Design a protein around this ligand. Structure first.
Ligand SMILES: CCCCCCCCCCCCCCCCCC(=O)OC[C@H](COP(=O)([O-])OCC(O)COP(=O)([O-])OC[C@@H](COC(=O)CCCCCCCCCCCCCCCCC)OC(=O)CCCCCCCCCCCCCCCCC)OC(=O)CCCCCCCCCCCCCCCCC
Ligand SMILES: CCCCCCCCCCCCCCCCCC(=O)OC[C@H](COP(=O)(O)OCCN)OC(=O)CCCCCCCCCCCCCCCCC
Ligand SMILES: CCCCCCCCCCCCCCCCCC(=O)OC[C@H](COP(=O)(O)OCCN)OC(=O)CCCCCCCCCCCCCCCCC
Ligand SMILES: CCCCCCCCCCCCCCCCCC(=O)OC[C@H](COP(=O)(O)OCCN)OC(=O)CCCCCCCCCCCCCCCCC
Ligand SMILES: CCCCCCCCCCCCCCCCCC(=O)OC[C@H](COP(=O)(O)OCCN)OC(=O)CCCCCCCCCCCCCCCCC
Ligand SMILES: CCCCCCCCCCCC(=O)OC[C@H](COP(=O)(O)OCC[N+](C)(C)C)OC(=O)CCCCCCCCCCC
Ligand SMILES: CCCCCCCCCCCCO[C@H]1O[C@H](CO)[C@@H](O[C@H]2O[C@@H](CO)[C@H](O)[C@H](O)[C@@H]2O)[C@H](O)[C@H]1O
Ligand SMILES: CCCCCCCCCCCCO[C@H]1O[C@H](CO)[C@@H](O[C@H]2O[C@@H](CO)[C@H](O)[C@H](O)[C@@H]2O)[C@H](O)[C@H]1O
Ligand SMILES: CCCCCCCCCCCCO[C@H]1O[C@H](CO)[C@@H](O[C@H]2O[C@@H](CO)[C@H](O)[C@H](O)[C@@H]2O)[C@H](O)[C@H]1O
Lengths: 486, 69, 469, 198, 91, 179
C-alpha cells in the first residue's frame, strides 16, 4: 500500500463531507478523538524504564524533505517524546475536543474558519510538545500568534482588536529575545537538540547572558510580574475556545520550556539567578491576587487567577527539588483542567445567556440556575486548592520546594492559600448568593453539553488529587533529570 | 499483556544513532565554516587561465629597463 | 540574451503599433522564461566557488552574481506579466493598466545596468552601469507623462541621483588619485592597514546607498514611490536596491565601519517609526523597504555574508512582489478609484476585503507575518540568519535595535491585515468578471513559496556549501 | 444510516416546494410574534417538511460517489429543513411526531425522548471510553514505578550478599532483609564516584 | 516478572560522545539514588513499628533507629546526575 | 584603570556641543519656512545650542566622574551619564514626571549601550569568529566562547559558592563509611 493513498482517502472523505454537509466540526471532532486514542496507544507502547526519547522522527531533511529521515547526517527538525512531553500531550489531546464542543452552537458566522483555527492551534501545541531542538520548538512556539490574532480579532468580544494586537506583540517581544538566545546557542555550539545539550558546558559569563533572554521570554509567556497585563485582556476578550486553549496549554508551554531549554542547559546560571526568580514569583503571586480583589469582570477575574498559580508553579520548578518539579507539573495539569471549566462558566454559559460580564449584574444564580451554582462552588473550591484535587497537591509540593530552596520566600508565599480563597470566594458568594438579579431574566440551566465538559474536567482533577501518584510512571526520571546538586 | 514497548537497549541504540548523526552534522558545519574563510589561490579566486598576477603593461614604447622583480 | 532582446525589441516595436505592445511583452516574458530554463545549467562553472574574470578584468562572474541575475530575471518575468496580461477585460482596467510603447525596452536596459553593476570588477564599469540604470529609471518614472505627480518625481529623481552620482565619481577619482587604479582587487591586507582609506570607501558606499533611500535621505525616494504609478513603483522600489546592495556585499568595503553602523541604526528606527502614521499604502511599503534595506545594510560589516544576503533578498523580493500584487488585485473591491495611475492610495480602502475575497486576505496575512518574521515562514529564517551573522561578528547593540525595529514595524504591517479582516456593509455577492489566470497563478506561487519554502532549507544549505564555500 | 438512500427527484421537487413557503425566521411568528397568526394548513405543512429533517436522505456510498450539483442541492435545501425545524422547536415549543398508522404529522408536546444531539455519538462512544482507557493504562503502568523495582533490587542484593537467608523459613526472610539493609549500605553510588576518592 | 538488573556505568570511565554510555550512567546514578531511598524507607518503617510496639519505651528502644533516620534523611535523597556529570571533583 | 581628566574632557565636550548646536541652528535656519535672515539663527532656534551643550557637558562630566568615583571603566558609568543627559533633556519640559521618566529611560538605554560594550561597532578581536571557539582540548582554561564536556569543581564552588546543594565534595563519597 501507499501512504498517499491513505491520506488521499481521508482528504477525499473530508471534501465530500464538506460538499454534502457544509460544516467541518463533526470531522474535526472525529479527528480529535482519534488523535486522543492514538496518543493513548502510544502511551500503551511507551517504556517507562527508559529516560531516552522515544517515537523519534525527523522532518525536512536534505535527503527527504517531504518524508522521514534515516540519514547519518541530520540537518532537519527533530521530534520525539519523553514522559514530560507525554504528560502535556495527554492534556492537550484531552482538551482539544472540549474546546471544539464548547463553541458548538454559539458560532453562527464563518463557523468553519473558527473550527479550523482552533484545531490548528491545538495541533501546533501538540507538535510543540513533540519538539527536540530549539528551532522546531521556536517555530511551533511562535506559529500560534497569527492564528490567535485572527481568531480573537474576527470572533472576539467588544475590545477584540486590542486583545489581538496584545497577544501578538507582547509574545513576539519576549520571543525575539528568546530567538537571540537560541541564535547564540546555535553559533556557539553548532548544534540545537534537546538530547545532548546537557553535555555542553558553557562558560558562566555566557550562560548568564543566554539565561536573560530565555527568562524574558518565560516572563512574558508565563506570565510574571511586571509583564502580566496582556493576560486579562486576551483571556477576557477572546472566544471561549481561545481562552480555554490559552490558559490550559499555552501558559504551560512556558513551564515545559523552563524544564526543557533552561535547566538542562544553563545549570550554573540558573543556580546563580533563581533568587531573582523567587522575587518575581512572590510579587506575581501576592500583587496579582490583590489586584484580582478589585476587578469587575468575571472572565478577567479568572484570567488574573491563572497568574498566581503559575507563579507558584514557577516557585516549584525553580526549586532544585524533585518534589517541587512534580508539584509544578501537577499544577500545570490540574490548572489546565480547572481553569477552562471556570472559563466555560463565565464565557460560554453566562456570556451566552446574557452577553455581559460585569459582576454588578450577577447575583443569586442559585434560585433558577442551581446546577450551575453547584458547579461554581466545586470549581471555585478546586481552584483555591482544596485537598483531593490536584491543585492542592501541586501547590503543596511547589511550596515545599520553595521552602527548601529559600525558607523565607517560600514561607511568605504560603499566603497564596488565603488570597486565592479571598478573590475566588468573593465572586462565588455574590454569584451564588442573594436574591436573583433584577437586571437578568430567567434562562435555562446548564445543558447536557456544558455539563459533560465540566464533569470531564472535574473527574480528571479529582482523580489526580485523590491519587496523584498515577502520573509518576512518566515523571520519575524527570524529577531527577533537572536537579543540580553535588 | 497488551503492553509491548520497545526494549531499553533498542531505544538507547536508536537514540545513539540519532545523536551520532547530529554530531556529524555539527562537525560538518564546523568544517564548512573553516573551509570558507580560508585563503584561496589566485586561480580559484580571480583567473584560472591567466594565472599570473604580474601586470605586463603597454607595448608601444616599451623601454628596456622597465621590468622589475 | 538581454542585448539580443533589446536590439530585437527596438526594431520590432518601431515596426509595430500600440495595439501590439502587450503581446510584445508576453513574447519577451516567454523569452526570459526560456532563457532561465535552458541556460541556467551554467551554475556548474562555479563549482567550489570558482570565480572568473571577463572582458579583460572588467567583469567578475561567481555564484553570487549568477544567483542575483537569475533573481533579476524572475523579477522581470513577474513585472512583465503584470503589464502583458489584463487583470479584467473591462474598460476600467484598459484605462488604468496599459503599457506604453517604450516601457519594455527601458525595463530591459535597466536590467542590463543592474547586472553590470553586480558583475562589475572595475569602477569604470560600475559607473557606466550605475548611469545606465539611473537614466533608464528616470525615464521609467517619466514615461507616464500625463501624470503631474510622475513628471515631478521624474525631475526630483534626476537631480538627486545626479548629485549622488557626482559623489560616486568623486570617490572613484580620489581612489585613483591615491592608488592609481580603478580596481578593488588592488587592495589587500597590507594596503588597507598601511593606507588610511576609509573616507574614500565610505564616500563610495554612501553615494551608492543614498540612491536606495538610506536615511537621512529617504523622504525623496519615498515621495517618488508614492507619486509614481503602482506598476512602476513595484519595479523602481526593488531592482535598484538588489543591484546596489549586491555590489556592496560582494565588494567588502565597510567591514567594521562606525558610520555605516550609525546610519543603519538610523534607517531601522526611521523605517519603523515613520511608517506608523502613514495612511497611504505605498508610503507604508516604502518605509518597509527602508527598514529591510537597514537589515541588509547590517551585513555590510561582516566579511562572510553571502548566505544571509541571498536568503533575505530573495524572500524580500518575493514578499514585495506578493504584497504589491495583492494591492493590485484589491482594486476590484475598493468602492472609490482615486486616479488613473494610483487607483488605490489609502489603507482604509481595503476595509472589508475578507467578505469579498477571503483567500486574498489569507495571502495578505501570510505576507504580513513573513514581513513581521513569524515562523515557519521565510522572513523568520531571513532574520535568523542575519542575527546569526551579526552576533557571530560582535554587533550586540545593533541586534537589540533590530529586535525593536522588528516589533515597531509590525504595527504598520498589521494595519493592513486589521483593516482587511474588518466587517463591511455592502459586500459582494456575485460578479461575472473573473481575474486573470496567469496573474492569479503567479501570486499563488509566490504565497506558496513564502509558506512552504522552509522545507528545502537543508537542501539549499547543502548546495550553498558546494557552490559558495 | 442507510447505504444508498439518495433520490434526486424528491430534492429537486423539494426546492421550490420550500420556496413557496415563507422564510424560516418569519414563518412561525407572522411579524406579530404569535403562533396563532400562522394558518393551520400552513402549520401542518411546516410540520411535515420539518419532520423531513430527521430522515435518512443520503448514505455513505452516495456522498462518496455523486457529483457536486446534487450535493449542493441536498445541502441548500437541507439547511432550510434544519432552520424550519429548530425555529418551530423554539417558537412553538413543540416537535413534530408522526404517529404510527395515521399519515398526518403535527407539532406536539412530547419531549421526554425521541430527540438526540449530533455530538453525542462522537463523544460518548469515542472520547469517554478513550479516557477510561487512559485511566486504566495509568493505573496499570503505575505498577512499573521505580519504587517497586528498587525494593526488589535491594532485596536481591541482600540475598546475593547473604544467601543464608533463603533457607530460613519463608515468612521470616523479610525481617532479615530489613536487618541487613539497616546494617549495611547496598547502594552503589560512591561506586560510581571514582574521581572523588582522592 | 522478569525483573531487570541493568549494568552500572560511571561518568568517570566513559567518553561523552558515546551517548549510550552517557544515558546508562545517568540511569545508573538515578537508580542507585532510588535504592538509597528504599533503604531510608526501610529504616523509617522499622522506626514506626518499634514506636508503635514500645510506646513510652520508644525513647530507649528506638534510639539508634531514630538517630539513623535523621542521619540518613539529609543524604539519602534525590540529588540529580548533572552535578557530577558536569563537574570533575579531581580538579 | 587610568583616571579620566574630567574638566578637560568636559571643556572639549562643551566646545563640541556648541559647534554642533551652531551647525544645527544654521541648518534649521536654512530649512525653515517663514521669513528668516542671519538674525534668526539664535532667536528662532528651539534651544538647539543649549540642548547640545547641556547634553554634552552632562554626559562627559557624569561619565568621567562615575568612572573616577567607582574607580572602574564599565557600563554603569554610561547609565549615569544617560541619567544626567535625560535629566537635562527633561528639565526642558517643565513637568516632574516627564523629567523622571526621561532620566530613568535614557539612563537604562545608555546603560544598555554601555553594557553591550559602549559601541555601535564591533570589537572584532573579541567576537566569536576571531576568538578561540569549540571544545577545549587538554585540561586548558575554558575561555568565554569555548565549550567543555566536564568542568572543574573548584571552579564551580568559587563561581557559585558553597551551600544550597553545591559542595566541595559529593555527598555520597563524603558520607561513605571508611570501609
Ligand atoms: C496528563 C494526565 C491527565 C490524567 C487524566 C486522568 C484520566 C481522566 C479520566 C476521565 C474519566 C471520564 C469518564 C467519562 O468520559 O464519562 C463520561 C460521563 C460524563 O458524565 P455525564 O453524566 O454524562 O454528564 C452529562 C449529565 O449527566 C447530563 O445532565 P444530567 O441531567 O444527567 O445532570 C446530572 C448532573 C448534574 O448535577 C450537578 O450539577 C452536580 C455537579 C456534578 C459534579 C460531578 C463530580 C463527580 C462527583 C463524584 C462524587 C464522589 C465523591 C467521593 O449530575 C451528574 O451527572 C453527577 C452524577 C453523580 C454520580 C451519581 C451517583 C451514582 C453512584 O461520565 C460517566 O459516564 C461516568 C464517569 C464516572 C467515572 C469515575 C471514575 C470512578 C473510578 C472507580 C473508583 C474505584 C476504582 C478506581 C481504580 C480504577 C482502575 C481501572
Ligand atoms: C500562518 C499563516 C497565517 C494564516 C492565518 C489564517 C488567516 C485566515 C484569514 C482569512 C480566512 O478567513 O481564511 C479563509 C478561509 C475561508 O473563509 P470562510 O470563513 O469560510 O469564508 C468563505 C470562504 N469562501 O479558508 C480557510 O479555511 C483557511 C484556514 C486557515
Ligand atoms: C498530520 C496527521 C498525522 C497523524 C499522525 C499519524 C501517525 O502518527 O502515524 C504513525 C505511524 C505509525 O507509527 P507507530 O504506531 O507509532 O509505531 C511505530 C513503529 N514503527 O507511522 C507513520 O506514519 C510515520 C510517522 C508519521 C510522522 C507524522 C509527522 C506529522 C508532521 C506534520 C508536519 C506539520 C507541518 C507544519 C510545520 C511543522 C514545523 C515544525
Ligand atoms: C557629492 C556632492 C558634491 C560635493 C562634494 C564635496 C566634497 C566631498 C567631501 C568628501 C566626501 C564626502 C564624504 C561623506 C561623509 C562621510 C565620510 C565617512 O563616513 O568616512 C569616514 C571614515 C571613517 O569612518 P569608518 O571607516 O566607518 O570607521 C572606522 C574608523 N576607524 O574616514 C575618516 O576617518 C574621515 C577622516 C576624518 C577627517 C574629516 C575631515 C573634516 C575636517 C573639517 C575641519 C573643519 C575645521 C573646523 C570647523 C570649521 C567650521 C567653522
Ligand atoms: C562649527 C564648529 C564645528 C566644531 C567641530 C565639532 C562640531 C561637531 C558637529 C557634529 C555634527 C552636528 C550636526 C547636527 C545635526 C544636523 C542638524 C539637524 O538639525 O539635523 C536634522 C535636520 C533638520 O531638522 P529640522 O529642520 O531642524 O526639523 C526637525 C523637526 N523634526 O534634518 C536632517 O535630516 C539632517 C540629518 C543629519 C543627520 C546626520 C547623521 C546623524 C546620525 C544619527 C545617530 C543615531 C545613533 C544613535 C543610536 C541609538 C539607538 C537607540
Ligand atoms: C535561482 C532562481 C531564484 C528565483 C527565486 C526562486 C527561488 C529558487 C531557490 C533555488 C535556489 C537553489 O537551488 O540554489 C541554492 C543557492 C545557490 O545555488 P546555485 O548556485 O544558485 O545553483 C542553483 C541551480 N539552479 C538554478 C539550477 C537551481 O543558494 C541559496 O542561497 C538560495 C537561497 C534562496 C532561499 C529561498 C528558498 C525558496 C524556496 C524554494 C522552493 C522550491
Ligand atoms: C499535525 C498533526 C499533529 C500530529 C502530531 C502527532 C505525531 C505523532 C507521530 C508519532 C509516531 C512516530 O513513530 C515513528 O516510529 C519510528 C521511530 O522508531 C519511526 O522510524 C521508523 O522508520 C521505519 C522506516 O521504514 C522503520 O520502522 C525504522 O526502523 C523506524 O522504526 C517511524 O517512521 C515513525 O512512525
Ligand atoms: C530592551 C530590553 C533590553 C534587555 C536585554 C539586555 C541584553 C543586553 C546584552 C547584555 C550582555 C552583553 O555582554 C557584555 O558582556 C561582557 C561581560 O560579560 C562585556 O565585557 C566586555 O566589554 C567590552 C567593553 O569594554 C570589552 O570587550 C571588555 O574587555 C569586556 O570583555 C561586553 O561588553 C558585553 O558583550
Ligand atoms: C538577551 C541575550 C542576548 C544578548 C545578545 C548578546 C549575546 C552575546 C553576549 C556578549 C559576549 C561578550 O563577550 C565578550 O566579553 C568577554 C568577557 O566577558 C570576553 O572574554 C574574555 O574576557 C577576558 C577579560 O577581559 C578574559 O581573558 C576571558 O578569558 C576572555 O578571553 C570576550 O572579549 C568576549 O567574549
Amino acid at each position: 500500500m501507499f501512504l498517499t493513498s491513505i491520506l488521499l482517502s481521508s482528504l477525499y472523505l473530508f471534501n465530500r463531507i464538506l460538499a454534502w454537509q457544509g460544516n467541518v466540526k463533526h470531522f474535526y471532532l472525529f479527528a480529535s478523538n482519534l488523535l486522543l486514542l492514538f496518543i493513548v496507544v502510544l502511551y500503551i507502547n511507551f517504556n517507562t524504564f527508559s529516560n531516552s526519547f522515544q517515537f523519534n522522527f525527523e522532518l525536512f531533511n536534505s535527503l527527504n524533505p517531504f518524508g522521514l529521515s534515516n540519514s547519518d547526517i541530520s540537518n532537519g527538525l527533530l521530534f520525539g517524546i519523553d514522559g514530560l512531553s507525554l504528560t502535556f500531550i495527554l492534556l492537550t489531546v484531552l482538551l482539544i475536543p472540549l474546546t471544539l464542543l464548547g463553541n458548538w452552537y454559539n458560532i453562527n458566522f464563518n463557523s468553519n474558519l473558527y473550527y479550523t483555527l482552533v484545531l490548528a492551534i491545538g495541533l501546533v501545541i501538540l507538535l510543540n510538545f513533540w519538539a527536540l531542538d530549539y528551532i522546531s520548538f521556536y517555530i511551533l512556539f511562535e506559529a500560534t500568534l497569527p492564528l490567535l490574532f485572527i481568531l480573537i480579532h474576527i470572533y472576539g468580544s467588544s475590545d477584540s482588536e486590542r486583545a489581538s494586537f496584545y497577544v501578538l506583540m507582547f509574545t513576539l517581544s519576549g520571543s525575539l529575545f528568546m530567538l537571540l538566545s537560541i541564535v547564540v546557542i546555535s553559533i556557539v555550539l553548532n548544534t540545537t537538540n534537546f538530547i545532548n545539550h546537557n553535555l555542553f558546558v558553557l562558560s558562566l559569563d555566557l550562560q548568564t547572558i543566554i539565561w536573560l533572554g530565555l527568562f524574558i521570554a518565560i516572563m512574558v509567556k508565563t506570565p510574571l510580574f511586571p509583564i502580566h497585563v496582556w493576560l486579562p485582556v486576551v483571556h477576557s476578550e477572546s472566544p471561549l475556545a481561545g481562552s480555554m486553549i490559552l490558559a490550559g496549554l499555552i501558559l504551560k508551554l512556558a513551564l515545559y520550556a523552563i524544564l526543557r531549554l533552561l535547566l538542562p542547559l544553563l545549570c550554573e546560571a540558573q543556580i546563580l539567578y533563581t533568587p531573582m526568580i523567587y522575587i518575581i514569583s512572590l510579587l506575581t503571586i501576592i500583587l496579582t491576587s490583590l489586584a484580582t480583589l478589585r476587578q469587575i469582570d468575571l472572565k478577567v477575574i479568572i484570567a488574573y487567577s491563572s497568574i498566581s498559580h503559575m507563579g507558584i508553579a514557577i516557585l516549584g520548578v525553580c526549586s532544585n527539588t524533585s518534589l517541587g518539579i512534580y508539584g509544578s507539573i501537577v499544577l500545570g495539569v490540574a490548572h489546565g483542567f480547572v481553569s477552562p471549566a471556570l472559563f466555560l462558566i463565565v464565557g460560554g454559559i453566562l456570556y451566552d445567556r446574557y452577553h455581559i460580564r460585569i459582576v454588578n449584574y450577577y447575583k443569586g444564580l442559585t434560585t433558577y440556575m442551581p446546577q450551575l451554582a453547584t458547579y461554581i462552588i466545586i470549581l471555585s473550591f478546586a481552584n483555591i486548592g482544596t485537598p483531593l484535587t490536584g491543585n492542592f497537591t501541586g501547590e503543596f509540593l511547589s511550596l515545599q520546594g520553595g521552602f527548601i530552596r529559600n525558607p523565607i520566600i517560600g514561607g511568605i508565599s504560603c499566603i497564596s492559600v488565603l488570597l486565592a480563597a479571598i478573590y475566588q470566594l468573593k465572586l462565588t458568594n455574590k454569584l451564588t448568593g442573594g436574591i436573583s438579579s433584577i437586571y437578568m431574566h430567567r434562562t435555562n440551566d446548564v445543558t447536557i453539553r456544558e455539563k459533560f465538559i465540566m464533569n470531564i474536567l472535574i473527574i480528571s482533577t479529582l482523580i489526580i488529587g485523590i491519587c496523584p501518584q498515577i502520573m509518576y510512571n512518566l515523571l520519575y526520571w524527570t524529577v531527577n533529570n533537572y536537579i543540580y546538586i553535588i | 499483556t497488551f503492553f509491548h514497548p520497545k526494549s531499553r537497549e533498542d531505544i538507547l541504540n536508536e537514540e545513539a544513532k540519532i545523536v551520532q548523526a547530529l554530531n556529524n552534522q555539527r562537525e560538518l558545519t564546523i568544517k564548512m565554516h573553516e573551509l570558507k574563510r580560508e585563503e584561496k589561490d589566485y586561480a580559484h579566486s580571480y583567473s584560472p587561465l591567466f594565472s599570473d598576477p604580474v601586470p605586463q603593461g603597454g607595448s608601444i614604447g616599451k623601454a628596456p629597463g622597465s621590468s622589475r622583480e | 540574451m538581454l542585448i539580443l532582446a533589446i536590439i530585437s525589441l527596438i526594431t520590432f516595436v518601431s515596426m509595430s503599433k500600440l495595439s501590439d505592445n502587450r503581446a510584445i511583452i508576453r513574447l519577451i516574458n516567454i523569452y526570459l522564461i526560456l532563457v532561465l530554463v535552458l541556460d541556467s545549467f551554467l551554475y556548474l562553472l562555479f563549482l567550489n566557488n570558482q570565480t572568473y574574470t571577463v572582458m579583460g578584468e572588467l567583469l567578475i562572474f561567481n555564484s553570487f552574481t549568477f544567483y542575483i541575475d537569475m533573481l533579476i530575471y524572475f523579477i522581470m518575468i513577474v513585472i512583465s506579466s503584470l503589464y502583458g496580461y489584463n487583470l479584467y477585460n473591462n474598460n476600467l482596467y484598459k484605462t488604468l493598466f496599459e503599457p506604453k510603447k517604450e516601457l519594455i525596452i527601458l525595463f530591459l536596459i535597466n536590467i542590463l545596468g543592474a547586472l553590470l553593476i553586480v558583475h562589475s570588477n572595475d569602477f569604470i564599469t560600475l559607473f557606466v552601469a550605475i548611469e545606465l540604470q539611473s537614466y533608464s529609471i528616470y525615464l521609467i518614472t517619466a514615461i507616464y507623462n500625463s501624470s503631474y505627480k510622475a513628471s515631478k518625481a521624474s525631475m526630483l529623481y534626476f537631480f538627486m541621483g545626479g548629485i549622488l552620482s557626482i559623489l560616486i565619481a568623486y570617490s572613484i577619482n580620489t581612489y585613483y588619485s591615491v592608488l592609481n587604479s580603478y580596481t578593488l582587487h588592488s587592495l589587500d591586507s597590507l594596503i588597507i592597514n598601511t593606507l588610511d582609506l576609509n573616507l574614500i570607501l565610505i564616500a563610495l558606499s554612501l553615494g551608492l546607498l543614498f540612491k536606495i533611500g538610506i536615511a537621512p535621505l529617504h523622504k525623496w525616494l519615498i515621495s517618488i514611490y508614492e507619486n509614481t504609478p503602482i506598476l512602476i513603483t513595484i519595479y523602481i522600489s526593488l531592482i535598484p536596491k538588489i543591484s546596489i546592495l549586491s555590489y556592496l556585499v560582494l565588494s567588502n568595503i565597510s567591514i567594521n565601519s562606525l558610520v555605516i553602523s550609525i546610519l543603519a541604526i538610523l534607517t531601522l528606527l526611521v523605517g519603523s517609526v515613520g511608517g506608523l502614521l502613514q495612511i497611504k499604502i505605498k508610503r507604508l511599503l516604502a518605509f518597509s523597504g527602508l527598514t529591510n534595506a537597514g537589515y541588509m545594510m547590517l551585513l555590510l560589516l561582516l566579511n562572510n555574508n553571502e548566505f544571509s544576503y541571498l536568503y533575505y533578498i530573495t524572500q524580500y523580493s518575493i514578499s514585495h512582489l506578493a504584497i504589491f500584487m495583492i494591492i493590485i488585485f484589491s482594486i476590484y473591491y475598493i468602492n472609490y478609484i482615486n486616479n488613473q495611475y494610483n487607483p488605490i492610495i489609502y489603507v482604509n480602502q481595503l476595509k472589508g476585503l475578507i467578505h469579498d475575497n477571503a483567500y486574498l486576505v489569507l495571502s495578505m496575512a501570510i505576507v504580513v507575518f513573513s514581513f513581521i518574521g513569524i515562523p515557519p515562514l521565510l522572513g523568520f529564517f531571513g532574520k535568523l540568519n542575519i542575527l546569526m551573522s551579526i552576533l557571530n561578528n560582535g554587533y550586540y547593540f545593533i541586534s537589540i535595535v533590530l529586535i525593536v525595529a522588528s516589533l515597531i514595524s509590525a504595527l504598520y504591517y498589521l494595519y493592513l491585515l486589521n483593516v482587511s479582516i474588518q466587517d463591511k456593509n455592502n459586500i459582494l455577492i456575485n460578479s461575472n468578471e473573473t481575474v486573470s489566470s496567469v496573474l492569479s497563478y503567479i501570486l499563488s506561487s509566490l504565497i506558496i513559496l513564502i509558506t512552504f519554502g522552509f522545507i528545502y532549507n537543508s537542501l539549499i544549505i547543502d548546495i550553498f556549501n558546494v557552490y559558495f564555500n | 444510516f442507510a447505504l444508498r438512500a439518495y433520490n434526486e427527484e424528491k430534492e429537486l421537487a423539494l426546492k421550490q416546494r420550500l420556496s413557496q413557503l415563507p422564510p424560516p425566521g418569519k414563518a412561525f411568528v407572522t411579524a406579530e410574534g404569535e403562533p396563532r397568526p400562522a394558518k393551520e394548513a400552513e402549520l401542518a405543512e411546516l410540520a411535515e417538511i420539518a419532520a423531513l429533517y430527521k430522515t435518512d436522505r443520503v448514505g455513505i456510498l452516495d456522498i462518496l460517489l455523486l457529483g457536486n450539483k446534487h450535493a449542493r442541492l441536498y445541502r441548500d435545501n437541507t439547511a432550510l429543513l434544519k432552520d424550519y425545524y429548530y425555529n418551530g422547536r423554539r417558537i412553538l415549543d413543540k416537535i413534530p411526531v408522526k404517529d404510527k398508522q395515521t399519515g398526518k404529522v403535527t407539532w406536539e408536546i412530547k419531549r421526554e425522548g425521541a430527540e438526540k444531539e449530533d455530538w453525542v455519538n462522537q463523544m460518548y462512544f469515542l472520547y469517554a471510553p478513550s479516557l477510561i482507557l487512559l485511566l486504566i493504562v495509568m493505573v496499570y503502568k503505575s505498577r512499573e514505578d521505580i519504587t517497586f523495582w528498587a525494593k526488589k533490587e535491594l532485596d536481591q542484593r541482600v540475598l546475593d550478599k547473604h544467601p543464608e537467608i533463603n533457607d530460613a523459613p519463608e515468612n521470616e526472610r523479610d525481617a532479615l532483609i530489613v536487618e541487613r539493609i539497616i546494617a549495611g549500605d547496598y547502594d552503589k553510588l560512591a561506586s560510581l564516584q571514582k574521581k572523588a576518592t582522592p | 516478572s522478569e525483573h531487570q538488573r541493568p549494568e552500572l556505568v560511571s561518568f568517570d570511565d566513559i567518553n561523552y560522545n558515546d551517548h549510550k554510555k552517557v544515558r546508562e550512567a545517568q540511569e545508573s546514578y538515578t537508580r542507585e539514588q532510588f535504592i538509597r531511598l528504599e533503604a531510608l524507607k526501610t529504616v523509617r518503617k522499622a522506626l514506626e513499628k518499634c514506636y508503635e510496639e514500645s510506646g513510652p519505651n520508644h525513647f530507649e528502644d528506638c534510639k539508634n533507629l531514630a538517630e539513623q533516620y535523621l542521619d540518613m534523611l539529609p543524604t539519602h535523597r534525590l540529588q540529580g546526575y548533572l552535578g557530577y556529570q558536569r563537574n570533575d571533583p579531581s580538579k | 584603570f587610568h583616571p579620566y581628566n574630567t574638566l578637560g574632557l568636559a571643556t572639549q565636550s562643551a566646545m563640541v556641543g556648541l559647534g554642533a548646536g551652531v551647525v544645527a541652528a544654521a541648518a534649521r535656519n536654512s530649512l525653515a519656512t517663514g521669513p528668516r535672515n542671519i538674525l534668526t539663527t539664535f532667536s528662532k532656534s528651539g534651544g538647539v545650542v543649549t540642548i547640545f551643550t547641556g547634553a554634552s557637558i552632562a554626559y562627559v562630566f557624569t561619565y568621567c566622574s562615575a568612572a573616577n568615583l567607582r574607580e572602574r571603566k564599565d557600563g554603569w558609568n554610561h547609565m549615569w551619564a544617560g541619567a544626567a543627559t535625560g535629566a537635562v533633556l527633561g528639565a526642558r519640559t517643565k513637568l516632574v514626571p516627564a523629567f523622571i521618566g526621561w532620566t530613568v529611560l535614557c539612563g537604562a538605554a545608555c546603560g544598555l549601550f554601555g553594557w553591550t560594550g559602549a559601541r555601535f561597532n564591533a570589537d572584532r578581536k573579541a567576537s566569536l569568529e576571531q576568538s578561540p571557539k569549540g571544545f577545549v582540548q587538554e585540561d586548558a582554561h575554558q575561555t568565554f566562547w569555548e565549550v567543555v564536556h566536564r568542568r572543574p569543581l573548584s571552579l564551580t564552588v568559587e563561581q557559585l559558592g558553597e551551600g544550597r546543594g553545591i559542595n566541595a565534595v559529593p555527598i555520597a563519597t563524603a558520607t561513605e563509611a571508611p570501609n
